[PDB]
Amino acid sequence: RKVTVATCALNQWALDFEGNLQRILKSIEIAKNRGARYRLGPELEICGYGCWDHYYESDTLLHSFQVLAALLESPVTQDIICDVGMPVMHRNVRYNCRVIFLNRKILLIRPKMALANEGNYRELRWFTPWSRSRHTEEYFLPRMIQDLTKQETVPFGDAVLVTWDTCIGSEICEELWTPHSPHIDMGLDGVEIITNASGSHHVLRKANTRVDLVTMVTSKNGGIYLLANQKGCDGDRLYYDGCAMIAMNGSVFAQGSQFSLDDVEVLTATLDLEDVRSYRAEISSRNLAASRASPYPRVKVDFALSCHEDLLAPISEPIEWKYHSPEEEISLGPACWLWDFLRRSQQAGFLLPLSGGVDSAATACLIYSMCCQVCEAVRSGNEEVLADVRTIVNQISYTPQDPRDLCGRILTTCYMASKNSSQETCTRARELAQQIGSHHISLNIDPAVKAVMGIFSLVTGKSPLFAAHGGSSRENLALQNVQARIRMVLAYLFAQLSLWSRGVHGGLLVLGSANVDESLLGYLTKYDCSSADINPIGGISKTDLRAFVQFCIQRFQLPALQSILLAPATAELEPLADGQVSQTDEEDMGMTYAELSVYGKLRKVAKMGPYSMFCKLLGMWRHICTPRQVADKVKRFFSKYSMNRHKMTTLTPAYHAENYSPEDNRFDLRPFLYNTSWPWQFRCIENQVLQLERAE
Amino acid sequence: RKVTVATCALNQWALDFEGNLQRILKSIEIAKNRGARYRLGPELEICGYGCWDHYYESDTLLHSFQVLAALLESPVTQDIICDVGMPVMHRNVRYNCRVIFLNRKILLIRPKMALANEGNYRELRWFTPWSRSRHTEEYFLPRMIQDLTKQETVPFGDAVLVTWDTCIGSEICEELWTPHSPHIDMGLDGVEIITNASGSHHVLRKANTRVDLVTMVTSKNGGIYLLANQKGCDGDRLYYDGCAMIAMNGSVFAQGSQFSLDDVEVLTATLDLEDVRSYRAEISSRNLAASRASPYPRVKVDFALSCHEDLLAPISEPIEWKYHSPEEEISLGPACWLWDFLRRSQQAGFLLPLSGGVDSAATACLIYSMCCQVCEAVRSGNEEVLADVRTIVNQISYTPQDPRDLCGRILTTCYMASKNSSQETCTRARELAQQIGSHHISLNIDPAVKAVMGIFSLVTGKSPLFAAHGGSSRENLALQNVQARIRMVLAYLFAQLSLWSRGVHGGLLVLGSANVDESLLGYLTKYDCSSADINPIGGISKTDLRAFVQFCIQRFQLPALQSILLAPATAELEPLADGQVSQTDEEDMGMTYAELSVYGKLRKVAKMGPYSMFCKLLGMWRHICTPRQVADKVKRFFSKYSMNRHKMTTLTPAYHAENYSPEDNRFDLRPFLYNTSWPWQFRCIENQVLQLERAE
Amino acid sequence: RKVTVATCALNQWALDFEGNLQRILKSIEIAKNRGARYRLGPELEICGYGCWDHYYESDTLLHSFQVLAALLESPVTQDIICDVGMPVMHRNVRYNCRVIFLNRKILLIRPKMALANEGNYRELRWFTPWSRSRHTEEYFLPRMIQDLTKQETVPFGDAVLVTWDTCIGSEICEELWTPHSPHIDMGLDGVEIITNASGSHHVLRKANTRVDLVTMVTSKNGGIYLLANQKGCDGDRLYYDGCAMIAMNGSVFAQGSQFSLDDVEVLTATLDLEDVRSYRAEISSRNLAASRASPYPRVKVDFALSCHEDLLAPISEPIEWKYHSPEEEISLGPACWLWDFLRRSQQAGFL
Numbered sequence A, B: 001r002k003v004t005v006a007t008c009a010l011n012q013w014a015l016d017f018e019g020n021l022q023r024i025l026k027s028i029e030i031a032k033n034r035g036a037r038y039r040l041g042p043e044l045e046i047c048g049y050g051c052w053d054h055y056y057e058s059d060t061l062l063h064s065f066q067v068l069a070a071l072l073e074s075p076v077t078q079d080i081i082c083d084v085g086m087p088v089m090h091r092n093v094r095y096n097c098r099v100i101f102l103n104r105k106i107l108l109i110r111p112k113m114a115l116a117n118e119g120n121y122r123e124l125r126w127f128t129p130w131s132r133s134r135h136t137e138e139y140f141l142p143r144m145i146q147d148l149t150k151q152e153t154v155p156f157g158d159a160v161l162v163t164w165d166t167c168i169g170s171e172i173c174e175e176l177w178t179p180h181s182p183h184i185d186m187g188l189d190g191v192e193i194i195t196n197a198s199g200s201h202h203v204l205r206k207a208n209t210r211v212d213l214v215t216m217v218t219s220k221n222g223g224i225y226l227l228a229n230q231k232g233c234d235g236d237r238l239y240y241d242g243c244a245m246i247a248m249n250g251s252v253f254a255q256g257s258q259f260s261l262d263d264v265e266v267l268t269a270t271l272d273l274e275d276v277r278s279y280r281a282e283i284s285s286r287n288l289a290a291s292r293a294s295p296y297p298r299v300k301v302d303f304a305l306s307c308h309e310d311l312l313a314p315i316s317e318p319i320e321w322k323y324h325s326p327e328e329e330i331s332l333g334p335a336c337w338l339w340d341f342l343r344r345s346q347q348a349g350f351l352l353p354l355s356g357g358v359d360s361a362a363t364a365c366l367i368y369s370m371c372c373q374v375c376e377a378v379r380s381g382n383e384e385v386l387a388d389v390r391t392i393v394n395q396i397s398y399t400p401q402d403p404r405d406l407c408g409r410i411l412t413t414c415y416m417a418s419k420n421s422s423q424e425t426c427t428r429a430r431e432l433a434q435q436i437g438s439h440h441i442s443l444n445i446d447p448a449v450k451a452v453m454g455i456f457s458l459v460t461g462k463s464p465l466f467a468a469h470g471g472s473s474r475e476n477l478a479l480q481n482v483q484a485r486i487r488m489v490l491a492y493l494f495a496q497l498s499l500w501s502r503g504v505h506g507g508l509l510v511l512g513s514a515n516v517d518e519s520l521l522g523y524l525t526k527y528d529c530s531s532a533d534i535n536p537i538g539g540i541s542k543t544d545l546r547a548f549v550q551f552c553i554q555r556f557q558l559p560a561l562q563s564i565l566l567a568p569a570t571a572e573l574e575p576l577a578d579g580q581v582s583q584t585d586e587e588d589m590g591m592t593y594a595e596l597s598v599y600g601k602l603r604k605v606a607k608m609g610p611y612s613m614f615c616k617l618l619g620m621w622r623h624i625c626t627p628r629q630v631a632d633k634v635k636r637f638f639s640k641y642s643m644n645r646h647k648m649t650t651l652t653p654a655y656h657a658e659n660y661s662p663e664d665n666r667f668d669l670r671p672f673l674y675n676t677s678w679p680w681q682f683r684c685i686e687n688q689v690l691q692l693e694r695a696e
Numbered sequence C: 001r002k003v004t005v006a007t008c009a010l011n012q013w014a015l016d017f018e019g020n021l022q023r024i025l026k027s028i029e030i031a032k033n034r035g036a037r038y039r040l041g042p043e044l045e046i047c048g049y050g051c052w053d054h055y056y057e058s059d060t061l062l063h064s065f066q067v068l069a070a071l072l073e074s075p076v077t078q079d080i081i082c083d084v085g086m087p088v089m090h091r092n093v094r095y096n097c098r099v100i101f102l103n104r105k106i107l108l109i110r111p112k113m114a115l116a117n118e119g120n121y122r123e124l125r126w127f128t129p130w131s132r133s134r135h136t137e138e139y140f141l142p143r144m145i146q147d148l149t150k151q152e153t154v155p156f157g158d159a160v161l162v163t164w165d166t167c168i169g170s171e172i173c174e175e176l177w178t179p180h181s182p183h184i185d186m187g188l189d190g191v192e193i194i195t196n197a198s199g200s201h202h203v204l205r206k207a208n209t210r211v212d213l214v215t216m217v218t219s220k221n222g223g224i225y226l227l228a229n230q231k232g233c234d235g236d237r238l239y240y241d242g243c244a245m246i247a248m249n250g251s252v253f254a255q256g257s258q259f260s261l262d263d264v265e266v267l268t269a270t271l272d273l274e275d276v277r278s279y280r281a282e283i284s285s286r287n288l289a290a291s292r293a294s295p296y297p298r299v300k301v302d303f304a305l306s307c308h309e310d311l312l313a314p315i316s317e318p319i320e321w322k323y324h325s326p327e328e329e330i331s332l333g334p335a336c337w338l339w340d341f342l343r344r345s346q347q348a349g350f351l
């Protein structure tokens, strides 16, 4: 009848065994206080999901087991079934596993059967899928575990648990949406509870597909579904957004946070198993298509999941899943990201080159949002967060209440004007900093620039001129770039010495402000301020950035943003001749951010090369453009793209948000020395155009 | 009786279909002129091996076929069997394939059955292995091919080719390295000739493994074995080093270049099939197993490998494989990789910061080596090299004979001294430049440094001091780093404007000079000159570098190097107080380049975390060090490594040389925000140390 | 690229071969006027789904074939692929089938693999599920059909059609919600269009589950989904409420009536196949869990589903499915029921 189960989101850290252990323990202790008899944790939670090439290392395996032993001998784990994740090597093959134990015995080790090998995922690099479906083998335990557990071997493979009162089965992360998912046969076999341990990272706007899936599955097959997921940054450019859930028969009973500053969040629910049994009768109490397939092996477990609590235990009522707006998503994720980055880097704060333009502004807003979250958290009684703030600012007695106050201690904004900067942009940056609370620095680079160009003249005997002073296209560009790069040099100097100049220990993380759209076209200066330490908006669309900044006005009460939004998007690096005004980035690029986004998505999402893309747009923009015209747009896109790709190889690491990122380290593997005339492809395009231009 | 076969190495280029088509045609034409009736190409040669995520694009598939259709309708391919590679989608699964055609008819498509998923390889990201052994399906041909070939379908799978006189089998690359390789069962079923198309890249010293393996195989199994490989840079960090070979019954019959400036290099041999047959007939255990061997599907082909060429057509005689010394390898690999960048980037030359030290010196030697190579190639009658040069140099009449004259056209060294630089280092740089013939630039950064520091003072009211002037540790470092990044600002300014100042069109690629040992430890300044466009020595050991440079003294007649070798490895950026001499980078790092090299190899090559590494060293350095000491060495390494790993994320792409490269984009994936205290792991280490101190 | 397909709801009548034929013809004629190159009809539409114990009767089989012959020799069926349903006995075993023909040839006969045996359904009483998955056998045609079609045998079993431009597959009624549905492997194999012929009867309030399913399926696997269903009373206490639909990539493009007094209702839609191909790339352009299962047999069909019409043919835009309130459901179904009862009973009225 009535059972009480727990799932959870943990902020795990790659190879951080000590912390990882304490987090797992805490969740189990929490679940037990709430009356749970089964606890589900995230995929590979013992070592942290993102260990990458450390999985090749045997030490990883070893410590994981030492962590497992600690769990097994811990008095908290008594009388609750615990499903943890670690790597495990069986017969010289490395598997991504679930280790399920109860009262100092291992019940079953259950290896993953479908591995993620797309986008940021590459599990086949380190793990093998279990291929012997509906079968188990005897796994031989480490003497370390034997001595403790008093078992020689345990079942290893595709099996389910049978207890005195129920039948629980495992579905690991992506097995949930893999063709022919375990949950189908488990359902058929009569499995009433299905646990899914995830490690899925944030992706702007796609939170609902996870929820929908679990929902549909429970709706279609009946049953309780448990989903646990990592939450936070585990040591790289991903943010895991654990929307841990508990679903039954198509309804949701517990909704876990997508972004929060909690290291441990536990969901429970009290459900009557008979609701499953009667909901399944409601559908098909009959037989099926006559399948006669090999049935699931069964691990007998001497334990009752439901135990006497009924007399008081309130049944969980169904709930509606509340989603975040896309702007709320943006204001929360990169924000919580930046918080883990700061706290785990053990760095003294951030250094933000603030230009008075939209992106640098958005970046500033993310920090302010971070501060708010921290204040919220501290108010909420979050000891970990309080501990951390106190450690970051060095003040034992400190207690952030006003976000502007915390911000000041944590953020240093820096406006670096050139000879041609307007008074307006300088002002806007000054105002925005004033409003969020940051320590603002305003300086002029021109003395350093004059000096560099002096060195050049001194040695070549030649003086480059700006385009407006009769300079060549090359000279103009070079000059612009020098200023860009001097800014970067200065940014790092302050990162390294500004706190020093204020009488205080420590150094700052440099933050970048490239957006995903310009990153793709390479419309940036190699090694200017586009290269920093971390970039939180690197993966966000320009349009979304504007959207996010306009949303910040009212949510954070920052009026300084209006002028910033209204101002013309221009880079004041070159003097303006009489009769003309500044050129906008969109004219500079030779395409609007809108249409740039389309190329982006057609390229990475829809997997189109130039010919394919030419054909798509030809129809999409059939009214607006002519065949010759789209050819030119596409050609212009691919050439600029290819010419600039090398800029991508060295680009600052970015929070992952859009599934159309051009990021080269993990998500978008590509050449960087292309033939930039695309002779063959472009010829195909021409032929098509010529063919169409034969119509009357 | 006698058959004439060809294999080759092509300098393919990712997505360069036009180019790739022309090079394949050339190989086939060269093959025919030399009398071959079979021609084998490299792995995925139509599209070029390294298209990475473009493999997801239908356009890659489509254009590959268009190339194929071109090959099929081409007169040159008449009466020679052609083994060509491309990706194929079959039943909506994407495979790495060989396509064998003859006289406008596709004979068979052979999919790869084992993929490479380690190191720089990750075929599983985009392809699936064919897994039905000795089995075949019908491939439905694209309409375009049908209209040309008048075929509806062709066999797709694990099949062999039967001619009137022989039986030909395919082994694709990594299949040769798998435990139960195809060549075993193939040889037992009477396949006489085995063809292997590879696409494997350079690794210092590992050339013999490929040779020994193919030789062993034909020795153990009998038969002729052909290997083809890409040669050169196809668009990324890798150099494919085509050691294409022909081997029979354990002897080599043709050895292809490892590094050469040739786009197309064809090997042919004339062999007697009767030698194969009698070699096999002499192995009793083989024959006992061959009269019981499981059969391969055979595609019957109306063709004779041995024609009316028999008339005294001279049988090929056995040869000894000649190898390169490790220094010759270094002298030739990155050199060719550099030529390929220069010509395929359509850039006007290189800009090399030259410090008067070993590594930058090495980089200079590579460029000179390249120059010699180009000169040698031109003297050989190589028309594409001569064209390529004239294009780079914009003078259609130019003929590089002297290596020093070419060098001055395409290289620009740049010495950049600080206030503290010594006169010696200046002169070493200058003397090296004179001797290789580069255009040398000598300047002082001090004016620019003062200007930047003046900016900092104007805005903070504080002035940083060098440690020798009582500055703090941080001040001293900030100061050193500033100078360092200023050098980078200048480097790019000259890269962009130096030719302009000399009244010449174009720009330069900036070369880096980070070695693989410093890259590992993070012993470099983020965004100093460590950050360039490409780094030809970023994957090479400090010890190999010295060895290389010392080799260059006699090989290239460059005496300036001796002083460069003999001089103390010091970075003159800070002033030294008297009573004290300048600190070497080895005491700066806190470890010798030697012990560093060991950490790096134990790390990547032996897959070792800090506990494992401590254990290994403890035994290795048992005489030299005490366990307490070993722990400190290991902890210091791991500490430094992980505090600095972020420097890897934005670091300049390096030519891949060692298999212990710490490169983060492809070869060595790792997190970049570690818990740098390594609590768990260091605890385990201290436990062992205590345990060892108590007992004895 | 652009194709035009048709599905339909028919008011079929058990054993009413004459009428059943004329209804099928009419739908095909309508589809052709609308430019369709493939037409999908309901489950067992030739004999009418509700024949019950008449399925034991060989006459049923016979007339069905005589009806099939009439379809085959009819000039209306020219240049459109027609998927009709009849019972068919292969090797002395009775199967509930799809007969797909084009220009007086049978392309493939495709038998049901999961049979409904719950509530009002009892298909196992008369039919056997096809159990040899991913396999076909040579079905020997009746001389009646041979003479007309000039074919000795045709493929019988679990197969897909491959045309010059696309790949079409079959999912019969309840196979849509049976564990391990054909649409999963068909998707994997690259089937771009999936036809589902239904005979599902009205059930108060449960209309959305049909729509949701088709929707979710196309959303999850990509592809065009076609669903046809009987509509009206076929001679007993059931009302079939054909919510025939056309779905693609998770959106609905055509919504058929649940209750109407039409004997024939045809849905069409003009869709670009490349939307499927690019929507599937959007999800997983990679590989899967490494399944290595026996793949679908392929019937080669010398026909192009898309033919030159593009230059004028408007692409169908997505629509929202409009449901009836429960009271509207009540006011319409039993109502349309009573109408067929009155008209087919040949009675003078009600008391």
Ligand SMILES: Nc1ncnc2c1ncn2[C@@H]1O[C@H](COP(=O)(O)OP(=O)(O)OC[C@H]2O[C@@H]([n+]3cccc(C(=O)O)c3)[C@H](O)[C@@H]2O)[C@@H](O)[C@H]1O
Pocket: A477, A480, A481, A484, A523, A524, A525, A526, A528, A571, A573, A588, A643, A646, A672, A673, A674, B344, B345, B347, B492, B495, B496, B507, B508, B509, B510, B533, B534
């Ligand atoms: N295939 C290849 N592989 C490796 N390297 C390659 C290469 N092709 C060129 N390179 C090299 O890469 C280097 C590129 O860097 P660099 O020479 O500095 O120039 P680059 O970064 O290419 O040009 C900077 C761009 O930024 C834009 N801009 C201007 C002003 C402000 C802003 C702003 O929004 O902040 C942007 C401007 O319009 C310009 O197009 C060159 O040295 C070039 O030789």
Ligand SMILES: Nc1ncnc2c1ncn2[C@@H]1O[C@H](COP(=O)(O)OP(=O)(O)OC[C@H]2O[C@@H]([n+]3cccc(C(=O)O)c3)[C@H](O)[C@@H]2O)[C@@H](O)[C@H]1O
Pocket: A345, A347, A492, A495, A496, A507, A508, A509, A510, A533, A534, B477, B480, B481, B484, B523, B524, B525, B526, B528, B571, B573, B585, B588, B643, B646, B672, B673, B674
């Ligand atoms: N976990 C983490 N994730 C992301 N970023 C992190 C980080 N931890 C620190 N950071 C940040 O990274 C930045 C590091 O750069 P920076 O502050 O400039 O300083 P950094 O590059 O760390 O220090 C330079 C090193 O180069 C050596 N050096 C000196 C003189 C000459 C030479 C030579 O051979 O050329 C070398 C010197 O001994 C020193 O150890 C800092 O802003 C820091 O806050």
Ligand SMILES: Nc1ncnc2c1ncn2[C@@H]1O[C@H](COP(=O)(O)O)[C@@H](O)[C@H]1O
Pocket: A353, A354, A355, A356, A357, A360, A414, A415, A416, A417, A418, A421, A487, A512, A513, A514, A528, A529, A530, A571, A572, A573
């Ligand atoms: N005036 C400025 N002050 C501070 N940072 C700037 C300034 N201008 C540009 N940046 C930085 O440079 C990048 C944008 O380049 P630009 O478009 O030329 O303004 C972003 O990373 C900014 O943070």
Ligand SMILES: Nc1ncnc2c1ncn2[C@@H]1O[C@H](COP(=O)(O)O)[C@@H](O)[C@H]1O
Pocket: B353, B354, B355, B356, B360, B414, B415, B416, B417, B418, B421, B487, B512, B513, B514, B528, B529, B530, B570, B571, B572, B573
């Ligand atoms: N005096 C110099 N002149 C030119 N390049 C230098 C100089 N010193 C250092 N570099 C560059 O900086 C890196 C080495 O740093 P360092 O060890 O401090 O000399 C290499 O990439 C060198 O090319």
Ligand SMILES: [Cl-]
Pocket: A141, A142, A143, A144
């Ligand atoms: Cl052990």
Ligand SMILES: [Cl-]
Pocket: A296, A297, A298
């Ligand atoms: Cl069992």
Ligand SMILES: [Cl-]
Pocket: A505, A506, B474
């Ligand atoms: Cl400090």
Ligand SMILES: [Cl-]
Pocket: A357, A358, A359, A568, A569, A570
């Ligand atoms: Cl802006």
Ligand SMILES: [Cl-]
Pocket: A358, A569
């Ligand atoms: Cl803007």
Ligand SMILES: [Cl-]
Pocket: B472, B473, B474
């Ligand atoms: Cl100090």
Ligand SMILES: [Cl-]
Pocket: A474, B505, B506
């Ligand atoms: Cl120019």
Ligand SMILES: [Cl-]
Pocket: B357, B358, B359, B568, B569, B570
């Ligand atoms: Cl040195």
Ligand SMILES: [Cl-]
Pocket: B358, B569
């Ligand atoms: Cl040295």
Ligand SMILES: [Cl-]
Pocket: C141, C142, C143, C144
């Ligand atoms: Cl008959």
Ligand SMILES: [Cl-]
Pocket: B138, C296, C297, C298
């Ligand atoms: Cl087939």
Ligand SMILES: [Mg+2]
Pocket: A357, A358, A359, A360, A569
């Ligand atoms: Mg902006």
